[PDB]
Amino acid sequence: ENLYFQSNALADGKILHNQNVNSWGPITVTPTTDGGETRFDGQIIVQMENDPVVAKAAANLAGKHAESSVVVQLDSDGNYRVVYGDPSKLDGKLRWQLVGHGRDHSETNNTRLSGYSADELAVKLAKFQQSFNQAENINNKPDHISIVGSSLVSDDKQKGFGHQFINAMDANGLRVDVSVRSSELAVDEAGRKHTKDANGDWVQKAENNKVSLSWD
Ligand SMILES: O=P(O)(O)O[C@H]1[C@H](OP(=O)(O)O)[C@@H](OP(=O)(O)O)[C@H](OP(=O)(O)O)[C@@H](OP(=O)(O)O)[C@H]1OP(=O)(O)O
Ligand SMILES: [Cl-]
Incomplete structure (x- = not known):
């Protein structure tokens, strides 16, 4: 069990590959059925690097809400490809889940997601919104971003x-x-x-391991 999780921890993938989306490996989603209520009418799972753990995580997230999820692979040039789902259905309250490995540890934990600083990531996502919205003729923006990478906020939050x-x-x-x-x-x-909790056990719904930042 812990074997599966440490093997799938979203930090320090040895080979960073965030360039040229056409050279990335594909993903296949296996839709699952036990994931109950979500507040999001639609979501985009944004795969930020070509790494097998990251690809698997992106596919698994999509599979939890397969009917209303879109998976996009997004590269360092801002080129993307839709690898799962239907961008034209995205309506209502939307989430983006960003999937990648956190790297480059510091006193406030990891400083990079898929090779991007916080500020670089924001620029990439702002360009992505513009490009996607015009290529797919959607006009919707996220209400929430879930950062799916290891240790990307300080221990004290x-x-x-x-x-x-x-x-x-x-x-x-x-x-x-x-x-x-x-x-x-x-x-x-x-x-x-x-x-992974303070003891080192892989746990679920540990609120001390997450923070939700908001414009209150
Ligand atoms: O309702 P649950 O099945 O317990 O699932 C929740 C819910 O996700 P869903 O949208 O899939 O229902 C949370 O979404 P929020 O509305 O709270 O945002 C999500 O939190 P994030 O959006 O922050 O990712 C959380 O994840 P976490 O385990 O980090 O709390 C996740 O629980 P699961 O991890 O069990 O899918
Ligand atoms: Cl809400």
Whole structure:
């Protein structure tokens, strides 16, 4: 069990590959059925790097709400490809879940998601919104961003990547709520997230491992 999770922890993938989306490996979603109520009418799972753990996590997240999820692979040039789902159905309250490995540890934990600083990520997402909305003729923006990478906010939840990111997103014209984890993070086969607690056990719904940043 813990074997599966440490193997799937979303930190420090050895080979960073975020360039040229056409060269990325595909994903296949296996829709699952036990994931009950979601407040989002639709969501985009944004795969930020070509890594097998990241690809698997993105597919698993999609499978939890297969009918209303779109998976996009998004590269360093801002080119993307829709690898799962129907962008034209995205309506109502939307979430984006960003999937990638956190890297480059500091006193406030990881400083990079899929090779991007908080500010670079915000720029990439703002360009992505513009490009996607015009290519797919959608006009919807997220209400929430869930950061699906390991340890991207400080242990005390006051500093780090998540804070720089929510502020940078707003400075780029996207005011959104952001959920982000201070612990190691992994996604199971049902698309549920598990975090590593203080003892070192992989656990579910540990609120001390997550913070939800908001414009109150
Ligand atoms: O309702 P549940 O089955 O317990 O699932 C929740 C819910 O996700 P769904 O949209 O899939 O229902 C949360 O979404 P919120 O409305 O709270 O945002 C999500 O939180 P994030 O959006 O922050 O990712 C949370 O994830 P976590 O385990 O980090 O709380 C996740 O629970 P699962 O991990 O069990 O899917
Ligand atoms: Cl709500």
